[PDB]
Design an enzyme around this catalytic site. Structure first.
Site, PDB file in Angstrom:
ATOM      1  N   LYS A   1      -5.388  -9.495  -7.707  1.00  0.00           N
ATOM      2  CA  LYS A   1      -6.106  -8.927  -6.556  1.00  0.00           C
ATOM      3  C   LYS A   1      -7.110  -7.937  -7.139  1.00  0.00           C
ATOM      4  O   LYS A   1      -6.741  -7.057  -7.906  1.00  0.00           O
ATOM      5  CB  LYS A   1      -5.118  -8.269  -5.603  1.00  0.00           C
ATOM      6  CG  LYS A   1      -5.814  -7.641  -4.389  1.00  0.00           C
ATOM      7  CD  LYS A   1      -4.745  -7.064  -3.464  1.00  0.00           C
ATOM      8  CE  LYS A   1      -5.406  -6.439  -2.243  1.00  0.00           C
ATOM      9  NZ  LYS A   1      -4.433  -5.945  -1.244  1.00  0.00           N
TER      10      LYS A   1
ATOM     11  N   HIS B   1       0.744  -1.251   0.000  1.00  0.00           N
ATOM     12  CA  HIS B   1       0.000   0.000   0.000  1.00  0.00           C
ATOM     13  C   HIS B   1       0.768   1.291   0.000  1.00  0.00           C
ATOM     14  O   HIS B   1       0.090   2.325  -0.116  1.00  0.00           O
ATOM     15  CB  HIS B   1      -0.895   0.007   1.295  1.00  0.00           C
ATOM     16  CG  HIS B   1      -1.829  -1.160   1.317  1.00  0.00           C
ATOM     17  ND1 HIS B   1      -2.830  -1.328   0.366  1.00  0.00           N
ATOM     18  CD2 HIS B   1      -1.840  -2.252   2.136  1.00  0.00           C
ATOM     19  CE1 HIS B   1      -3.452  -2.482   0.626  1.00  0.00           C
ATOM     20  NE2 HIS B   1      -2.858  -3.048   1.675  1.00  0.00           N
TER      21      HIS B   1
ATOM     22  N   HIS C   1      -3.049  -3.224   7.718  1.00  0.00           N
ATOM     23  CA  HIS C   1      -4.008  -3.481   6.649  1.00  0.00           C
ATOM     24  C   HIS C   1      -4.589  -2.156   6.175  1.00  0.00           C
ATOM     25  O   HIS C   1      -4.759  -1.243   7.008  1.00  0.00           O
ATOM     26  CB  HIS C   1      -5.158  -4.350   7.178  1.00  0.00           C
ATOM     27  CG  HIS C   1      -6.278  -4.615   6.230  1.00  0.00           C
ATOM     28  ND1 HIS C   1      -6.117  -5.387   5.104  1.00  0.00           N
ATOM     29  CD2 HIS C   1      -7.588  -4.228   6.248  1.00  0.00           C
ATOM     30  CE1 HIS C   1      -7.266  -5.452   4.446  1.00  0.00           C
ATOM     31  NE2 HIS C   1      -8.167  -4.766   5.117  1.00  0.00           N
ATOM     32  N   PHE C   2      -4.779  -2.003   4.865  1.00  0.00           N
ATOM     33  CA  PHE C   2      -5.456  -0.816   4.351  1.00  0.00           C
ATOM     34  C   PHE C   2      -6.938  -1.238   4.242  1.00  0.00           C
ATOM     35  O   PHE C   2      -7.249  -2.173   3.490  1.00  0.00           O
ATOM     36  CB  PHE C   2      -4.923  -0.425   2.976  1.00  0.00           C
ATOM     37  CG  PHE C   2      -5.541   0.872   2.513  1.00  0.00           C
ATOM     38  CD1 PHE C   2      -6.801   0.882   1.897  1.00  0.00           C
ATOM     39  CD2 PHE C   2      -4.882   2.054   2.777  1.00  0.00           C
ATOM     40  CE1 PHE C   2      -7.356   2.103   1.539  1.00  0.00           C
ATOM     41  CE2 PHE C   2      -5.436   3.270   2.399  1.00  0.00           C
ATOM     42  CZ  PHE C   2      -6.659   3.285   1.788  1.00  0.00           C
ATOM     43  N   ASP C   3      -7.805  -0.596   5.037  1.00  0.00           N
ATOM     44  CA  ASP C   3      -9.187  -1.080   5.076  1.00  0.00           C
ATOM     45  C   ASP C   3     -10.127  -0.442   4.067  1.00  0.00           C
ATOM     46  O   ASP C   3     -10.955  -1.114   3.447  1.00  0.00           O
ATOM     47  CB  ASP C   3      -9.693  -0.803   6.517  1.00  0.00           C
ATOM     48  CG  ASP C   3     -10.930  -1.687   6.806  1.00  0.00           C
ATOM     49  OD1 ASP C   3     -10.838  -2.878   6.535  1.00  0.00           O
ATOM     50  OD2 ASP C   3     -11.913  -1.091   7.248  1.00  0.00           O
TER      51      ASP C   3
END
Length: 121
Positions: free
Chosen positions: A37, A13, A115-117
């Site tokens: 992805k 990210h 984590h990139f939410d």
């Protein structure tokens, strides 16, 4: 771990140094390894600014866990979205630059993004 959670987050990210951006970046960052992805966001802010989001506004994560934080400031990001029903091994993406608040999940000691939410207008 051989790749830490923090390192995985940077790989997936972060891109503070910088039409085909997403096609190149999804491949170079190992997100087209046998599966394309579908959605992925890159953040063009310093890693320190992104790490500091872990002390900002607590919010629930998309999976319902409670360790997500929404940035107080808007940030320059790029969304990469899989297009034209493309499948491995021919992943094709659309590149969408925008300025949004980001939401990240944080964990560990030190407590950093893992984590990139999501992003929010």
């Amino acid at each position: 771990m051989k790749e830490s959670a923090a390192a995985k987050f940077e790989r997936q990210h972060m891109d503070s140094g910088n039409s085909t951006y997403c096609n190149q970046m999804m491949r170079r960052r190992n997100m087209t390894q046998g599966r394309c992805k579908p959605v992925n966001t890159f953040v063009h802010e310093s890693l320190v600014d992104v790490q500091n989001v872990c002390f900002q506004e607590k919010v629930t994560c998309k999976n319902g866990q409670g360790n997500c934080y929404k940035s107080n400031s808007s940030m320059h990001i790029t969304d990469c979205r899989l297009t034209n029903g493309s499948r491995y091994p021919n992943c094709a993406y659309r590149t969408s630059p925008k300025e949004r608040h980001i939401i990240v999940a944080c964990e560990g000691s030190p407590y950093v993004p893992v984590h990139f939410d999501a992003s929010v207008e």
